[PDB]
Design a protein around this nucleic acid. Structure first.
Ligand code: ADP
Ligand code: CL
Ligand code: MN
Ligand code: MN
Length: 555
RNA sequence: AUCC
């Protein structure tokens, strides 16, 4: 049937100059030594990505699909969604959102300047009146940081980002923002993965696991998901949106966004040249996350029925999926997974790596993470979310004139606070750096799901207790997998081994303690793992007082 | 210089 993309041969050009690594990395050169291994993707590789994501989709649905989709529409029909006012939508624009071609930017949008508001009014009017003319988009290469991988070819090509003008982006929110906040939760319930903190994700997976008489679990991820989404998938997404009760004006804008933007359209590079035409998900539109997540769910659940998965419990985040189910014996389990993959493949969601059944929860990786186990203060098993620290360490070492890595250190410290790598390596580095700079009490930003939260370093103990529990400060006897993976990642980036971080941490602890106040609390709680004779850590009063519920939720 |  349809090609994901077609190309005119015009280059995908840089969206500004692309920042230079420097000869000295003064904030991370005591974290690790192999700076040569840390790179950022750029437009120079966009052509290679374009080639890998351009292909012909043929899609073949069946009765399991029809049946799932039907259930999902019923579920959607219970949702009432409203238009956002033009002004509400304006003010949800992020502060550095890329400016309009029409002579205004995010500052103006967010402040509701008259020029910007009037442009947007007219964009909205045109959406209500013209349901057909394709809306032009810009295509750009994503700049992201990774550690080189010789196994997988050295350096990954840049992902492709496709987005419409700022004025349209505002209009998307008027039409769909309220739906983005309600629909996924309504159609998926507990299966919607972007509602859970790391501890909650763990709790849910363990509960799912313990509920089966004889569990089997697997993960799945689609190769290049956005390019595999069909025009028909996208119109099906609309029909799911339209099943909610909406005012008529929303219906009209939603249909018009669908036909003019979401299903496809022409693409221009940053120099304004025609670059290509698209017939798949534009990653960059408002509906990217909701769309990916709902369409993944529909396909996956239909594929579960097709393969005969018994008592499936799912967890879906975009195109990342875990399914925990009742094992039918390893022989049938393996057949069932092949049938799952074949069905997903008919549905136009082929796998990156073929999935495989597992019967031990530590061995399942989804959303770049997995559940592991360690022992707590009282010797009980304690489960928590971890990941390979390779990419976090590489991002910990991205330092340019334009970019400081300190916020990424913080982000990882918060999300992965119970992990051996955060506690021994990143915490030790973070605190050492800030003490020496004398910036310990200076607020930093925590970035998550596109939101930004201001955090003071000296409040970490309370934040961590609240988010992960007091046991995050007393885990020991980490697992073989985790010890092996962390040691290996450190060697690979030329970082000191864990025993050296332990010595460093003793010294960081003592300095923190010597400063008194909140600093000393950080030393006692965050680095109790580092001393010979432990302290008895007690609940922090400030922790009871904190509400962090918005950090890890969409809705 | 995309969206959640
Ligand atoms: N930075 C991003 N901006 C917008 N959308 C994204 C981003 N990262 C991932 N996505 C969306 O989620 C999908 C799945 O991502 P992933 O599994 O990480 O890679 P792939 O695109 O190869 O499947 C993407 O195809 C894209 O539509
Ligand atoms: Cl314990
Ligand atoms: Mn994928
Ligand atoms: Mn994925």
């Amino acid at each position: 049937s349809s090609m994901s993309y077609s190309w005119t041969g015009a280059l995908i050009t840089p969206c500004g100059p692309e920042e230079e690594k420097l000869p000295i990395n003064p904030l991370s050169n005591s974290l690790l030594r192999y700076h040569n291994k840390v790179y950022c993707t750029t437009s120079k590789s966009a052509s290679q990505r374009a080639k890998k994501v351009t292909f012909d989709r043929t899609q073949v649905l069946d009765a399991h699909y029809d049946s799932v989709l039907k259930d999902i529409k019923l579920a959607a029909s219970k949702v009432s969604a409203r238009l956002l006012t033009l002004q509400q939508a304006c003010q949800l624009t992020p502060p550095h959102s890329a400016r309009s071609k029409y002579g205004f930017g995010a500052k103006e949008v967010r402040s509701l300047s008259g020029r910007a508001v009037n442009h947007i009014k007219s964009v909205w009017k045109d959406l209500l009146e013209d349901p057909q003319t394709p809306i032009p988009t810009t295509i750009m290469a994503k700049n992201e940081v990774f550690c080189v991988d010789p196994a997988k070819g050295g350096k990954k090509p840049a992902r492709l980002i496709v987005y419409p003008d700022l004025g349209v982006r505002v209009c998307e929110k008027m039409a769909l923002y309220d739906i983005t906040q309600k629909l996924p939760q309504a159609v998926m319930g507990a299966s919607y993965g972007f509602q859970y903190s790391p501890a909650q994700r763990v709790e849910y997976l363990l509960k799912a696991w313990a509920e089966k008489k004889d569990p089997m679990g697997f993960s799945y991820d689609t190769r290049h998901f956005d390019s595999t989404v069909t025009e028909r998938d996208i119109r099906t997404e609309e029909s799911i949106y339209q099943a909610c009760s909406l005012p008529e004006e929303a219906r009209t804008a939603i249909h018009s966004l669908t036909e003019r933007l979401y299903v496809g359209g022409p693409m221009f590079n940053s120099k304004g040249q025609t670059c290509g035409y698209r017939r798949c998900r534009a990653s960059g539109v408002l509906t990217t996350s909701m769309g990916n997540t709902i369409t993944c769910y529909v396909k996956a659940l239909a594929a579960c029925k097709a393969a005969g998965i018994v008592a499936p419990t799912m967890l879906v985040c975009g195109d990342d999926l875990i399914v925990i189910s009742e094992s039918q014996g390893t022989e049938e389990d393996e057949r069932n997974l092949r049938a799952f993959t074949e069905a997903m493949t008919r549905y136009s969601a082929p796998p990156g790596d073929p999935p495989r059944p597992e019967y031990d929860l530590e061995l399942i990786t989804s959303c770049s993470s997995n559940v592991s186990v360690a022992l707590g203060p009282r010797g009980r098993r304690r489960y928590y979310l971890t990941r390979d620290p390779t990419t976090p360490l590489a991002r910990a070492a991205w330092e340019t004139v334009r970019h400081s890595p300190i916020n990424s250190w913080l982000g990882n410290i918060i999300q992965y606070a119970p992990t051996i790598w955060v506690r021994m390596v990143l915490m030790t580095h973070f605190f050492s750096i800030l003490m020496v700079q004398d910036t310990l009490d200076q607020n930093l930003n925590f970035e998550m799901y596109g939101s930004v939260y201001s955090v003071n370093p000296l409040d970490l103990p309370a934040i961590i207790e609240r988010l992960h529990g007091l046991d995050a400060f007393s885990m020991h006897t980490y697992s073989h997998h985790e010890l092996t993976r962390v040691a290996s990642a450190l060697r690979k980036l030329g970082a000191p081994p864990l025993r050296v971080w332990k010595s460093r941490a003793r010294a960081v602890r003592a300095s923190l303690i010597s400063r008194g106040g909140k600093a000393a609390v950080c030393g006692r709680y965050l680095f109790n793992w580092a001393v010979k004779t432990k302290l008895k850590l007690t609940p922090l009063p400030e922790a009871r007082l904190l509400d962090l519920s918005s950090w890890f939720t969409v809705g």
